Amino acid sequence: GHMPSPSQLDQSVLEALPPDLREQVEQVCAVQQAESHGDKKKEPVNGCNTGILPQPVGTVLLQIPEPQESNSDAGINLIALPAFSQVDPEVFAALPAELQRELKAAYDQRQ
Amino acid sequence: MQIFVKTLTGKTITLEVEPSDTIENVKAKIQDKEGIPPDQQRLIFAGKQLEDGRTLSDYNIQKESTLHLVLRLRGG
């Protein structure tokens, strides 16, 4: 109970090579091959991975627009006051409308 | 005596006081525990904000009693 490999199902199968092969022959990988040497390697992943660095499109079939904001560190220009990330809902229900309105000011002042 | 000061973040910061403790000095003890300047804290009890010049006794706050602490909700 077996079957032979295909030889015609698509152009890569007709050519009996993926385009990835001829591209790897044209350029083996990124410049990182010059580094992470260690006399031997189990896999090339501790190196240039015999390729180029992946992106999310190679993992999920979608697209993403260019970024329009930055997050170089999460603890600069922060709220630095009790706001939406940490104000407790039972305490907020107990807490008078006077500060509920002033606290909506503090939420608007977020970054 | 001690009182409980529930912060906006749901954390009870218990502190030791007298009924005659002024709100300014209570805010100063909050600064000692939470690190918020007293000029930049707001304090509520039973659905009203307090003022600095008053005391726990002015509000009939006694021992083992609960307050709210909020930052002033002003940048400085």
Side-chain angles (χ1 to χ4, degrees):
Chain A
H2 68 284
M3 60 181 181
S5 308
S7 308
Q8 36 48 276
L9 283 178
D10 180 40
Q11 299 299 99
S12 312
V13 194
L14 183 62
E15 292 294 278
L17 65 95
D20 176 76
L21 182 280
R22 61 177 291 173
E23 185 174 271
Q24 192 179 71
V25 171
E26 189 174 86
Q27 177 58 279
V28 294
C29 59
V31 70
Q32 298 299 96
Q33 200 177 47
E35 294 298 336
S36 309
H37 195 265
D39 184 74
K40 61 182 179 180
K41 27 59 62 181
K42 189 180 179 180
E43 290 185 272
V45 70
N46 184 30
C48 70
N49 198 41
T50 328
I52 306 295
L53 187 71
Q55 294 187 319
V57 188
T59 312
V60 282
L61 203 177
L62 53 66
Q63 294 184 310
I64 310 179
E66 286 67 55
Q68 297 179 53
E69 185 54 273
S70 307
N71 184 31
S72 312
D73 181 78
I76 55 175
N77 193 38
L78 71 170
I79 41 172
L81 65 86
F84 66 96
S85 318
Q86 56 188 250
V87 182
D88 175 274
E90 182 188 271
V91 112
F92 188 78
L95 177 272
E98 184 69 85
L99 296 201
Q100 296 180 19
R101 273 73 180 270
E102 194 82 299
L103 193 291
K104 286 176 181 289
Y107 286 14
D108 179 73
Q109 290 170 346
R110 75 189 178 278
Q111 298 284 268
Chain B
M1 62 183 205
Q2 84 286 270
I3 51 165
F4 315 130
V5 177
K6 222 165 187 188
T7 62
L8 269 210
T9 58
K11 176 265 297 287
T12 315
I13 165 254
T14 309
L15 61 147
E16 281 181 271
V17 298
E18 300 294 276
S20 40
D21 264 48
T22 42
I23 302 325
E24 181 178 83
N25 128 100
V26 165
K27 291 179 174 187
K29 294 176 178 183
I30 308 318
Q31 188 238 70
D32 182 72
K33 295 194 70 70
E34 299 304 302
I36 303 155
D39 182 62
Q40 176 159 61
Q41 294 168 40
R42 249 170 161 147
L43 228 63
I44 275 56
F45 178 57
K48 69 176 65 178
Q49 196 207 273
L50 312 195
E51 70 181 349
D52 273 62
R54 294 282 180 170
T55 51
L56 308 185
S57 276
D58 188 283
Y59 298 109
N60 273 233
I61 296 158
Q62 294 154 76
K63 60 73 150 179
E64 300 175 275
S65 292
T66 316
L67 228 65
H68 280 35
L69 163 290
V70 191
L71 196 143
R72 186 171 176 174
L73 310 186
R74 199 175 190 269

